[PDB]
Amino acid sequence: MTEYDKRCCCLREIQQTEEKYTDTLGSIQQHFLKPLQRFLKPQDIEIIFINIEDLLRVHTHFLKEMKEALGTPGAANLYQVFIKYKERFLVYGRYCSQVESASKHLDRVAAAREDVQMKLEECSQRANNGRFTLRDLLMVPMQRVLKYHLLLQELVKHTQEAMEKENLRLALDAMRDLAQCVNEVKRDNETLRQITNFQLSIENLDQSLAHYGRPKIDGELKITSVERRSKMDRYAFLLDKALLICKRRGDSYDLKDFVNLHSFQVRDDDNKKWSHMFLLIEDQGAQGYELFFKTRELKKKWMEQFEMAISNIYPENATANGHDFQMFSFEETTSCKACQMLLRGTFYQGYRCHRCRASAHKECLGRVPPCG
């Protein structure tokens, strides 16, 4: 076995596993979805099958592409099928963020309706001789999207060139990039799950908490202000852009003070409990708070979180090379103007320049070309 023989054993691998993959998707549509139409209501099918039909469309076109490329060329335009399909593949973001609850729903309909439980057995016999349950099938696409990087990785290390290899290495980066967007759409899904809970219980609250970014820490503290300067027991939520000072009893939380982190700065200073304190101070004025914690460990956690919040509001190089970069939530598929990989996730993925409108990861701000 040469490297050339090895190289040609896994371009096959790419083609046959992809073949098998579109087959499985076809199977899910045909022996499962379409029959179950038929017992179940639209809502419940929408729920269970997520965007599986669309995945089927995406991948059959992509299999065409891949086939032509591998077969017609001397394999040379392969890299470019992958690069071309990257952003159409972000649809896996939603699949993976919804598959757990598609699985759970299936169980429930399953248990509620034994005519459905029968059909399900019927269905997976018809399809794989009872070797795989519809639940099993539903994990498959998650598995598949996270294998392209390894495949191209392998095809790279038996690749003959220069020029052939570079754009395979590019194609790898596109695929590791995708995997990562998908990892973060899910984290953001559930981060937003946790915010929604912060919203629902409870509220003297007038905006969606989402506007202040991601939760950092939350818990019970006593607090002082200028206006009120004895210790008040309170429950606080720290997000990137705000501290929510609440009063605190039950599952109900009453918003009693909202602090904008943009305008505040942390300054510090018995081992008797509740002795442990730092300050939040206004810059251009006159509000200030003393935050007291039961325990040095508690101080100490909260300061780090405060420091992470403010570092997000005001990062290294937020003003490099002319720009004026702000925490931003991109609602449209977006790449970094320095590194050119994607901003990852659905929620406050990075930074926008208030003057250019240029987009960038936190870690890429100093590297963005200068604005006008």
Partner 1 sequence: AIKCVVVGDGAVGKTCLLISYTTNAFPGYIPTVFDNYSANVMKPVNLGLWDTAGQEDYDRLRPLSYPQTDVFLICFSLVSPASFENVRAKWYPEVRHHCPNTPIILVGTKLDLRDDKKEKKLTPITYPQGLAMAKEIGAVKYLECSALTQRGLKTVFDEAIRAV
Question: Which residues of this protein are in contact with partner 1, per CB under 8 A?
Answer: 1, 5-6, 9-10, 13, 17, 20, 96, 99-100, 103, 128, 131-132, 136, 139-140, 142-143, 146-147, 149-151, 153-154, 179-180, 182-184, 186-187, 190
Distance of CA 205 to the CA centre of its chain: 26
Taking CB within 5 to 8 Å according to partner kind, which of Zn ion, partner 1, none is near residue 63?
none
- Using DSSP bridges, classify how beta strands 350-353 and 242-247 pair: parallel, antiparallel or unpaired: unpaired
- Please choose, from the candidates 39, 205, 204, the residue with its C-alpha nearest in 3D space to the C-alpha of residue 119: 39
Q: Does 99 bind Zn ion (CB under 5 A)?
A: no
Tell me if 266 sits within 8 A of 279, measured CB to CB: yes
Taking CB within 5 to 8 Å according to partner kind, which of partner 1, Zn ion, none is near residue 179?
partner 1
Q: Does 356 bind Zn ion (CB under 5 A)?
A: yes
Taking CB within 5 to 8 Å according to partner kind, which of partner 1, Zn ion, none is near residue 142?
partner 1
Q: How far is the CB of 157 from partner 1 (least distance, A)?
A: 11
User: In this structure, what token pair is assigned to residue 130?
Assistant: 């009872």
C-alpha 40/C-alpha 118 separation (Å) is 13
Q: How far is the CB of 180 from partner 1 (least distance, A)?
A: 7
* H helical segments located in 113-235: 114-128, 134-138, 140-145, 148-156, 163-200
Rule CB under 5 A: which of 274-333 touch Zn ion?
A: 323
- φ and ψ at 236, to 5 degrees? -120, 145
Residue from 361, 362, 366, 369 that binds Zn ion (CB under 5 A)? 361
User: In this structure, what token pair is assigned to residue 273?
Assistant: 């409990």
Q: How far is the CB of 154 from partner 1 (least distance, A)?
A: 5
- φ and ψ at 89, to 5 degrees? -80, 0
Q: Does 365 bind Zn ion (CB under 5 A)?
A: no
Contact residues toward Zn ion (CB under 5 A) are 323, 336, 338-339, 353, 355-356, 361, 364, 371
